[PDB]
Design a protein around this ligand. Structure first.
Ligand SMILES: [Mg+2]
Ligand SMILES: [Mg+2]
Ligand SMILES: [Mg+2]
Ligand SMILES: [Mg+2]
Ligand SMILES: [Mg+2]
Ligand SMILES: [Mg+2]
Ligand SMILES: [Mg+2]
Ligand SMILES: [Mg+2]
Ligand SMILES: [Mg+2]
Ligand SMILES: [Mg+2]
Ligand SMILES: [Mg+2]
Ligand SMILES: [Mg+2]
Ligand SMILES: [Mg+2]
Ligand SMILES: [Mg+2]
Ligand SMILES: [Mg+2]
Ligand SMILES: [Mg+2]
Ligand SMILES: [Mg+2]
Ligand SMILES: [Mg+2]
Ligand SMILES: [Mg+2]
Ligand SMILES: [Mg+2]
Ligand SMILES: [Mg+2]
Ligand SMILES: [Mg+2]
Ligand SMILES: [Mg+2]
Ligand SMILES: [Mg+2]
Lengths: 205, 53
RNA sequence: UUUUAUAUAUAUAUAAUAAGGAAAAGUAUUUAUAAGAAUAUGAUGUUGGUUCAGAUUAAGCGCUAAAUAAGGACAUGACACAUGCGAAUCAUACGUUUAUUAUUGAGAUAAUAAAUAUGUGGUGUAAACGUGAGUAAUUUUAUUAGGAAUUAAUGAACUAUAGAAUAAGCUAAAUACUUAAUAUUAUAUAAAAAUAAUUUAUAUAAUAAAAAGGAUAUAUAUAUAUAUAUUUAUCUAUAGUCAAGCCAAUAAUGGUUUAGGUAGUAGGUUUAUUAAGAGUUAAACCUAGCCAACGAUCCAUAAUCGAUAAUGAAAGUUAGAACGAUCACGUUGACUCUGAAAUAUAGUCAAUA
RNA sequence: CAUAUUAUUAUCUUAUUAUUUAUAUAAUAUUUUUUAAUAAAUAUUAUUAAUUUAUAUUUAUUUAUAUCAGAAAUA
């Protein structure tokens, strides 16, 4: 049959309808006493110019098409070279819009800080517990709400996570202890049983 | 696609038919009837032996 | 261990408790094969080179030499050559020349014998033989169960089959030459698939391209023709056999103190040319490529190889004389005819003698 | 400094050859218009040799491209 060599495209777009394909073959060298790879580069016909650098292809025997070109591409097993340009263009397009959004956010934050006395205000509300400035500050347990800190949110979130983990583990252990109770749990929900119990128990919680 | 001037597939194998090869290569004479010839008998004998072989 | 008890807040601490004992007699080929020595040192060990012990030659030379049988024999100046041979053969291609017999009257024609290859022709010298200059690959060598452009209406020269072998001219005459007659591919329609093409069948178009008679006998008639038969020839067609043309992959010496090289250069599109692909050559228009420190380009050297020779335990290393395969050359260089194939040991031109 | 041989070339010369140009009262074949010499019959009418004419196959001539080999230059 026509000679067939598996290869990787190493140069493309330099010439018209011609690429360089990197063919590796197994040879035995006696002086080393080793099977080693021997490498060559073939000038190959690419009609349609589909193949891109980095793609994994055949190059198959053909009539002489030029002085140095005797092989033609037949198919592309791996389209990595093709994808490397599509992803490039998509990355450019997406980065532009994401840049624009984040720059808008930064400009907005600059405006907020430009607009820009909390201690004095809070003390004025505290002493009140006068009327007009108090109302204006209101527009600008209320003291507790105005001073609620993000750390409390972190504390409650941490407690939620720990409670969830511990409850899951204790229910798993409890159901695993009584094997029949595990089967009842499975049937009500409607080593394989172990995974099914784990899934159902976490879905419960 | 393949190159413009090339053939996508290799030439198809020409499967010999032994009966056809025998018929075309060595064909029995149509004119069986012939008269006496000194060299004609020898030529006929040689041709028959070669065809058989 | 395991299980359980009490106590304490599903878990924890203490206490007790433990299921693993079975038996039986008899039922070679081993493979391939690697040896060192002398010389350092005041002496020792080690590194280290040098030399030696073995085998062999395309051998030469010194001394010596009986016969027979076989295998080799200009490796150097691809330096120059006196002399003789190495490619002729056909009288059944055509012509000539004689002698006798016969009839015809210096000749004419037959029959029988001969000569004639200093005239016109056919076939053979692209082989074989010898050589190794060139060639480091741009076409060379080796190998592949490698290919296509998917190689010609190619037979070179035999086999098997069918056909045909006609007319003129010029030769003094012809199987010599010319002129003429006659006898796969490209399209269109379908079919399939080994399909993004190929193949198959059909119908057309042109295929459309030839030839040659001699030697004998007889049979006719009127020496002339003719008609057969036997022999040897000629042309065409199909198939076979033997063959050719082109490309791919891997390998093929030394020097980078030769590091950059290449502009037809690398690729693309067409056209001319071939049976056939391709910057192989010729023309045109585009792109900027291609090779290279895993060594390009350049230079030097060299015919290449084997189931050949030598050597080694072997991997390998050396040779390429002898046997065999391939290439190139026939004093040097280029081109041309013929041809299927030649830059032919041909021809032409030039160079050398 | 001197000798030598391969290689090349924006240079010079060029055998032969391959294409390619332009020309031929240039030929040869055939096709016409015509002229001589000749042949059969009652003014001929055709024939061969020469005149003019336009298609092929070449010859001489020159246009260009390449080209063995030679100088010149370089290595
Ligand atoms: Mg091409
Ligand atoms: Mg000593
Ligand atoms: Mg020795
Ligand atoms: Mg002898
Ligand atoms: Mg010699
Ligand atoms: Mg020799
Ligand atoms: Mg004779
Ligand atoms: Mg003669
Ligand atoms: Mg020869
Ligand atoms: Mg020989
Ligand atoms: Mg004649
Ligand atoms: Mg003839
Ligand atoms: Mg081309
Ligand atoms: Mg080239
Ligand atoms: Mg060009
Ligand atoms: Mg080098
Ligand atoms: Mg040599
Ligand atoms: Mg040589
Ligand atoms: Mg030899
Ligand atoms: Mg050698
Ligand atoms: Mg010899
Ligand atoms: Mg020669
Ligand atoms: Mg020569
Ligand atoms: Mg000589």
């Amino acid at each position: 049959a026509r000679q067939n060599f598996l290869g990787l495209v190493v140069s493309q777009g330099k010439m018209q309808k011609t690429v360089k394909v990197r063919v590796e073959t197994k040879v035995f060298n006696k002086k080393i006493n080793k099977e080693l790879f021997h490498r060559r580069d073939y000038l190959v016909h690419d009609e349609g110019e589909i193949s891109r650098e980095g793609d994994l292809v055949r190059i198959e025997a053909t009539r002489p098409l030029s002085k140095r070109k005797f092989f033609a591409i037949a198919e592309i097993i791996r389209n990595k070279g093709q994808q490397f340009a599509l992803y490039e263009s998509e990355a450019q397009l997406s980065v532009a819009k994401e840049e624009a959004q984040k720059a808008k956010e930064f400009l907005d934050k600059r405006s907020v800080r430009e607009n820009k006395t909390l201690l004095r205000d809070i003390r004025t509300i505290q002493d009140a517990l006068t009327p007009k400035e108090l109302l204006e500050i209101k527009q600008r347990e209320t003291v507790r709400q105005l001073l609620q800190l993000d750390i409390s949110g972190l504390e409650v979130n941490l407690e939620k996570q720990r409670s969830l983990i511990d409850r899951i583990q204790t229910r798993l252990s409890e159901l695993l202890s009584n094997d029949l109770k595990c089967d009842q749990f499975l049937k009500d929900h409607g080593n394989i049983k172990k995974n099914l119990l784990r899934k159902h128990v976490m879905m419960d919680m | 696609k393949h190159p413009k001037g090339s053939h996508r597939l290799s030439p198809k194998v020409n499967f010999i038919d032994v009966d056809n090869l025998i018929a075309k290569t060595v064909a029995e004479p149509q004119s069986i009837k012939s008269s006496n010839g000194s060299a004609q008998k020898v030529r006929l004998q040689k041709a028959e032996l070669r065809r058989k072989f």
